[PDB]
Structure formats: structure tokens, C-alpha cells
Ligand binder design. Structure first.
Ligand SMILES: O=C1CC[C@H](N2Cc3cc(-c4cc(CN5CCCC5)c5cc[nH]c5n4)ccc3C2=O)C(=O)N1
Ligand SMILES: [Zn+2]
Ligand SMILES: [Zn+2]
Lengths: 111, 27
């Protein structure tokens, strides 16, 4: 299946993941629109593994789109543009224990 | 320690000044 890279749209100097990392966590397919607490809508693609990201702040379950998971904000290591969030399980029974949700508008190609 | 939050992504900051710059960069 597709296995080529998704890169930072803003700087185009780093690969973040590959299409073979994409998976469906829920019924809403691998990518869907989610609404944040302030009315910003993020088309979020879920991937198992990502690279070239730096994390900001601490994990939080506030307004988590994926019950049982906490988010940590993730930004491009080169340009610091917001790319998505790392999700980490808050209980052992969950699988996967971690994944990444990447916001569609931050990535090239356009999924 | 990081009381200032970005309303677009949830990024938190110690310095409100850094928040302001971060918000600008979303544009
Ligand atoms: O699964 C996900 C991925 C992450 C995504 N999120 C969460 C989020 C939170 C906030 C946020 C948080 C706080 C701090 N809290 C206040 C009360 C307890 C501490 C404040 C304080 C003032 N404004 C704030 N805004 C802004 C944007 C976003 C966002 O995109 C989402 O909705 N769900
Ligand atoms: Zn970048
Ligand atoms: Zn932000």
C-alpha cells in the first residue's frame, strides 16, 4: 500500500511520517474533523509513529478526542509549526499505548 | 508553570509574550 512520506507543509525540510503508518482508531476512519474547545476544527489523521517532532508542555486529558488518551502538543523540530499531538494511553488495557494525531493542514501532500 | 494556553492547539507557555508570538505564527 502507500508508503511515501508526509512532510511539514510550512518548512518542507522534514518528513514527519509515512502513509503506511496510518490507521483507524475508531469508526470515523483514519481521518476525521474534530472540534477543539474554542471552535477550531482539526482534520486529524492518526498514525502509529512519527519523527522530527518536538513536544510542548505536559500530557493532558482535557477535551481529548480519543477517550482514554492524553494529548501532548507536537511541533516541527525545524520551524516549530504546530503539526499535531502525541496521544498516550492513561490505562494499560488500551491498544495502541501511543499514537500521533496529525492535523491535515500542517502536512504535505494534502491527504 | 505554563498558565498561558494557545486556543488553536493547546500549547502552554510560562511567558504570555511567547504565547502571543506562537499565536501569530498560526497565521
Ligand atoms: O484530543 C485533543 C487534542 C488537543 C485539542 N485541544 C485541547 C485544547 C485546550 C485548550 C485550552 C486549555 C486550557 C487549560 N485548561 C483550562 C482548564 C483546565 C486547564 C486553557 C486555559 C485557557 N484557554 C485554554 N485552552 C486550547 C486548545 C486545545 C486544543 O486544540 C483537543 O481539543 N482535543
Ligand atoms: Zn517545519
Ligand atoms: Zn497553537
Amino acid at each position: 500500500g502507500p508508503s511515501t512520506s508526509l512532510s511539514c507543509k510550512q518548512c518542507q525540510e522534514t518528513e514527519i511520517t509515512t502513509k503506511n503508518e496510518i490507521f483507524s482508531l475508531s469508526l470515523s476512519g483514519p481521518m476525521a474533523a474534530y472540534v477543539n474547545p474554542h471552535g477550531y476544527v482539526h482534520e486529524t489523521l492518526t498514525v502509529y509513529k512519527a519523527s522530527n517532532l518536538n513536544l510542548i508542555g505536559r500530557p493532558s486529558t482535557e477535551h481529548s478526542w480519543f477517550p482514554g488518551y492524553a494529548w501532548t502538543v507536537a511541533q516541527c523540530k525545524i520551524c516549530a509549526s504546530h503539526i499535531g499531538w502525541k496521544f498516550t494511553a492513561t490505562k494499560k488495557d488500551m491498544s495502541p499505548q501511543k499514537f500521533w494525531g496529525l492535523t491535515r493542514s500542517a502536512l504535505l501532500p494534502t491527504i | 508553570e505554563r498558565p498561558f494556553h494557545c486556543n488553536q492547539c493547546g500549547a502552554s507557555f510560562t511567558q504570555k509574550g511567547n504565547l502571543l508570538r506562537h499565536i501569530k505564527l498560526h497565521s
